[PDB]
Scaffold this motif. Structure first.
Motif: not given
Ligand SMILES: CC(C)CNC(=O)[C@H](CC(C)C)NP(=O)(O)CNC(=O)OCc1ccccc1
Ligand SMILES: [Ca+2]
Ligand SMILES: [Ca+2]
Ligand SMILES: [Ca+2]
Ligand SMILES: [Ca+2]
Ligand SMILES: [Zn+2]
Length: 316
Positions: A191-209
């Motif tokens: 919700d707060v990571y990279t406002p210019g890029i949709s659909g990403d995140s800082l980390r993923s628990m479901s697929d960390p890789a």
């Protein structure tokens, strides 16, 4: 401060309206008296002296852009308090209703948030990598969970114990996000990571890789960066937790999911009854197996699933 409990209204980082618990005495302060011995939110005023000033407002309306990170830090601290009390019968981070303190507008362009040993601290981000970090409910719960860990297992913040420390914060951050039930997912900080890029995140628990974090013990980082990779190796434990809850087949190992609530019970028990400051990944596996045994029985699906999940990520 001494005053009367009041209810303000404002807008958070993402533009959403919410009510907040305040205290009136000349000014309206971000002091929520409805939970434990209070939740207090402070203005660090772009500087690094902490906590700064208890947030004061003339009219109990918090719709200014400058107000938004304070609204969310204050509100999401309340949600996190409710999660721990209602779900785990834990009263604040110390178990005895310690006052919960947060400062926002920390430093300038500050792309991080942290627990400093005594309080939560949120940067505003630089507007590129992050927007103000208290806008993420998973982030707020991640930070308050560091306080819970420090008062309980006390996991040392380096190497494997530090990666467990991080994963515990991501796990409960995510469980709090599901508890509030607004756009919940198994991603961290979206919700707060990279406002210019949709659909990403800082980390993923479901697929960390997907962000280069390991999802198997054989891929663990053993260098010295990031306190021995605490935000990197957390992916191995995050993946195990995700599998316990949601199931899946990972490197050929199938895990039967048991759901979020049971994941939370197992990990809360491990954190508070079995983990120690020096616990490594193998010891976490043992703690989780024992916790599931206590709660559900040695022959239970829950115990079998915990074993499957740790097998899947290569932790024996
Ligand atoms: C690259 C960074 C963004 C990593 N930070 C994170 O993953 C999270 C915030 C996210 C959930 C948004 N912050 P965190 O893990 O609490 C940062 N940790 C941290 O600063 O620890 C170091 C420390 C600070 C103060 C006292 C003792 C030790
Ligand atoms: Ca106002
Ligand atoms: Ca989400
Ligand atoms: Ca999330
Ligand atoms: Ca983004
Ligand atoms: Zn952390």
């Amino acid at each position: 401060i001494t005053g009367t409990s009041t209810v303000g209204v404002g807008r958070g980082v993402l533009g959403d309206q919410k009510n907040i618990n305040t205290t009136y005495s000349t000014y309206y302060y971000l002091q929520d008296n409805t939970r434990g011995n209070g939740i207090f939110t402070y203005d660090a005023k772009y500087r690094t002296t902490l906590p700064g000033s208890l947030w004061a407002d003339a009219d109990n309306q918090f719709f200014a852009s400058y107000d938004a990170p304070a609204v969310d830090a204050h509100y999401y601290a309340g949600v996190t308090y409710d999660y721990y009390k209602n779900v785990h019968n834990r009263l604040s981070y110390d178990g005895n209703n310690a006052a919960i303190r947060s400062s926002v507008h920390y430093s300038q362009g500050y792309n991080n948030a942290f627990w400093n040993g005594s309080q939560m601290v949120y940067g505003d981000g630089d507007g590129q990598t992050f927007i103000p970090l208290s806008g993420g409910i998973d982030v707020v719960a991640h930070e308050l969970t560091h306080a819970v860990t420090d008062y309980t297992a006390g996991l040392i913040y380096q190497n494997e114990s530090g990666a467990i420390n991080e994963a515990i914060s991501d796990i409960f951050g995510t469980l709090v996000e599901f508890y509030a039930n607004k756009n919940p997912d198994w991603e961290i900080g979206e919700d707060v990571y990279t406002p210019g890029i949709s659909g990403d995140s800082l980390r993923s628990m479901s697929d960390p890789a997907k962000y280069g974090d390991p999802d198997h013990y054989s891929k663990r980082y053993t260098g010295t960066q990031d306190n021995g990779g605490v935000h990197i190796n957390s992916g191995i434990i995050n993946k195990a937790a995700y599998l316990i809850s949601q199931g899946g087949t990972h490197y050929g190992v199938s895990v039967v999911g048991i759901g979020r609530d049971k994941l939370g019970k197992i990990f809360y028990r491990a954190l508070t009854q079995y983990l120690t400051p020096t616990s490594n990944f193998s010891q976490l596996r043992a703690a989780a197996v024992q916790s599931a045994t206590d709660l559900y029985g040695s022959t239970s699906q829950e115990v079998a699933s915990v074993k499957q999940a740790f097998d899947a990520v290569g932790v024996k």
